[PDB]
């Protein structure tokens, strides 16, 4: 099928590290993995970037 | 050295520079950096490092 948004970013996140996913508030995200260390692995549907971010920076949207 | 902040979310480092947080951890924040990372001392663990800034709230002075 198609890429479906799973989450929305609610806080700004600016990477310090090469594996991180930059977030702006309101970014639509497709979260691929919620890791046990409370990082999320995702595709940012605004930028097309992929990476990890601190998991409490996004809320689930389930249309 | 008195508490400035309280952790509100669990944060487990992936990176060398990061500060581990448990919920309710007392923090002394030295810098709120312009890239939305906080630079702090965890007053429970005695560790120093950085964490994503919205993981801590200011305490009632």
Residue numbers in the entry:
A (entry chain AAA): 487 to 549
B (entry chain BBB): 489 to 549
In the authors' words:
The data confirm that exchange contributions to the transverse relaxation are present for residues within three regions of the protein. These residues are located spatially close to tyrosine 526 (Y526). A mutation of Y526 to alanine (Y526A) shows no conformational exchange, and conserves the protein backbone conformation, as evidenced from its crystal structure that we obtained at 1.5-Å resolution. These results show that the relaxation dispersion that affects around 40% of the residues in the SH3 domain arises from a single exchange process, with Y526 being the origin of the observed exchange.
